[PDB]
Amino acid sequence: ALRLGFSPCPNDTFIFYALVHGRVESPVPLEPVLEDVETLNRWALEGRLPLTKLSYAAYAQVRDRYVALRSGGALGRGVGPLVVARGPLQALEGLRVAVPGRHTTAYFLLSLYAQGFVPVEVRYDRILPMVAQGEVEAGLIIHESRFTYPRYGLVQVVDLGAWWEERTGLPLPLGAILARRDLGEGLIRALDEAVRRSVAYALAHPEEALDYMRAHAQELSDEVIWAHVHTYVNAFSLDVGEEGERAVARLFAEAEARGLAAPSPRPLFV
Template identity: 65%
Template sequence: MTGTVSALELGYSFCPNDTFIFYALHAGRVPAPLPVREVLEDVQTLNEWAAAGRLPITKISYRAYFEVMDRYVALRSGGALGRGVGPLVVAREALGDLNGRRVASPGALTTAELLLRLVSPGVRPVRMRYDEVMPAVARGEVDAGLIIHESRFTYPQYGLMRLLDLGAWWEGETGLPLPLGAILVRRDLPQDVQRGLNAAVRASLEYAYAHPQEPMNYIRRHALEMSDDVMRAHIDLYVNGLSLDVGAEGERAVRELHRRAVEVGAAPPSNLPPFVDLA
C-alpha cells in the first residue's frame, strides 16, 4: 500500500485515568499499527458518538457498549474496572427510599445510571453533564445526585453526604469487580489491527507506569480545576491491573453486568464475543 495513512481518531475523556493511560500513545512514545489522533470529550458525548459509529476507537461506558456490540468490540487493555470504584449517590440530607425521587444523572448510557436502575428502578433521572450534578444537588434542584469520576473525592466540598455506594452494592451482589468503562475498536477493522491497537494501549499504560511524572503536564492540562492530589487519587483508584488486561475475572464481571442489563430491559442481548481475540 502506498501513500499516507490517515490517522485513526481515538476518543477518550478529560479524566486523569484516561489521559494517564493514553499519554504515551498520543505523544508517540510507543508504536501503534496505525497513526492515532486524540479526540477528547466527556464520556456521555463519547457514548452518544459510539451509538452513531463516529469514531473507530473510543472510550465508552460499559452500559453504552451493550448498545453497540454489533459494531464495536472491546480491547482487553485500557478500560476502567475495579473494586471500590463505584458511582455514589449523594444528597444534602438523608433520604429514605430513592424510588420516586428526582436524581441527577450523568447520562442514560452511563454504567452509573444502569446500576441505579438495578437498585432503585423507580427513580426519576434528571440527566446532565457529570460536572453539573453536584452543583444541581447543592442548589436543591434535585433530591439527590449520581456522581462519577473525581466527584467521589470532592462532594463534601458541596456540603453533600453519601447515601449509597453503588460499587459496594455491586460487589456485595456479585463478588466481582465493577466494570465502568471500556476502550472499543470497530469490529470491521482487520483483526491484526485490533490486536495491534490492544498492544499499543497496553504499552502506553506500561510507559506511564514506568515514567509516572512525564504525563503529568498533559494530565493537568485536561483536568479542569482539579488539584494535583485529586488527580493522583483519581489515577490510583481507576487505573489498576485490570486496566492492563481485563483478565478472566473482569470478563466475567462484564458478562454479568450485561446479563443483568438485558434482564431488566436496559440492553439488547448479544452472542458476539465482548473482547478482542488475542490468539
Template identity: 65%
Template sequence: MTHATPSLDLGYSFCPNDTFIFYALAHGRVPAPMPVREVLEDVQTLNDWAREGRLPITKISYRAYFEVMDQYVALRAGGALGRGVGPLIVAREQLGDLNGKLVASPGSLTTAEMLLRVRHPDVRVVRMRYDEVMPAVARGEVDAGLIIHESRFTFHEYGLVRLVDLGAWWEGETGLPLPLGAILVRRDLPRATQWALNEAVRASLEYAYAHPQEPKGYIRQHALEMSDDVMQAHIDLYVNDFSLDVGAEGERAVRELYRRAVQAGVARASDRPLFVERP
C-alpha cells in the same frame, strides 16, 4: 510524491485515568499500527458518538457498549474496572427511601444510571453533564445526585452526604469488580489491527507507569481545576491491573453486567465476542 500515513481518531475523556493511560499513545511514545489523533470529550458524548459509529477507537461506558456491540468490540487493555470505584448517590441530607425522588444522572448510557435503575427502579431522573451534578444537588434543584469520576473525592466540599455506594452494592451482590468503562475498536477493522491497537494501549499504560512524571503536564492540562492530590487519587483508583488486561475475573464481571442489562431489558442478547482476540 509522498503520502501522509493514515491516522485513527482515538476518543477518550478529560479524566486523569484516561489522559494517564493514553498520553504515550497520543504523543507517539509507543509503537502503534498507525498514528492516532486524540479526540477528547466527556464520556456521555463519546457514548452518543459510538451509537453513530463515529470513531474507530473510543472510550465508552460498559452500559453503552452493550448497545453498540454490532459495530464495536472491546479491547482487553485500557478499561476501568475495579473494587471501591463505583458511582455514589449523594444528597444534602440523608433521605431514606429514594423511590419517587428526583435524581440527577450523568447520562442515560452510563453504567452508573443502569445501576441506579436496577437498585432504585422508581426514581425520577434528570440528566446533565457529570460535573454539573453536585452543584445542582447543592442548590436544591434535585433531591439527589449520581456522581462518578473525581466527584467521589470532592462531594464533601459541596456540603453533601453519601446515601448509597452503588459499587459496594454491586460487589456485595456479585462478589465481582464493577465494570465502568471500556476501550472499543470497530469490528470492521482487521483482527490483526484490533489486536495491535490493544497492544499499543497496553504499551501506552506501561510507559506511563515507567515514566510517571512525564504525563503530568498533559493530565493537568485537562483536569478541570482538580487539585494535584485529587488528580493522583483518581489515577490510583481507576487505573489498575484490570487496565493492563481485563483478565478472567474482569471478563466474568463484564458478562454478569451484560446478563443483568439483558435481564433488565436495557440491552439485546448477542453471541458476539465481548473482547478482541489474538489473531
C-alpha cells in the same frame, strides 16, 4: 491517523498519554478527540469513531459494531459511582436525581438499585452544585466527584460499586476501550497491545503524564489528579483478566434480563 475518543479525565489522559505522545509504539498514528463520556456514548450508537472509550453499559448496545480491547478500561471494586445527597435519605422513591448520562454504567447501576426516582440528565460537573443548591434531591456522581463531594456538604447514600460487589461478588466494569469492527482483526489486536503498552508506560513513568493530565483537567488540584489516577487505574486497566471477563458477562446478563441489551454470540473481547 485514526480518531481516538476518550474523556479529559485524568484516568483517560494518563492511560493514553504515551500512545498520543509517541512514547510507545502504535500500529497507526492516533488523533485524540476529547469529549464528555455521554457524548462518546451517543456517538457510538452511530458508529462514529473507529476507536473510543465507552461506558460498559453502552458497549452492550453496540456489539455488532464494536469489540472491546482487553486493555485500557476502568473496572474494579472501589471505582463505583456514588449517589450523594444533602443529608440521609430513606429511599430514592419520588426524588429527583441528577445523573451524568442515560447511557453510562452509573445510570445503569442506579437503575438496578432503585426504580422510583426521577432522572435529570446533565453534564457530570453540574451534579454536586445542583444537589447542594436544592435543584434535585440526590446526585449520581462520577469521575473526580467521589473525592470532592464533602466540599459541598454532601453525604454518600450508596456506593454502587460496593453494592454491585455485595450483589455479585465481582468487580464493577465501568468503562471500556472499543475498536470498530471494520478496522480488521489484525489491526485491532495490534491496537490492544499498543494500549496495554501505553498503560504500562504511564504506570512506570507517572510524572511524565502530569502536564498532559493537568492540561485537560485544569480545574483539578494535583492532589485530586493523583488520587483520581490512583483510584481508577488498576490491574484491570492493563488487562480485564479472568475475573474482569466474568464481571462484564454478569453486567451484560443483568442488562439482557431487563431487555436493555440484545444477546449476541460474538465474543466480548479481542
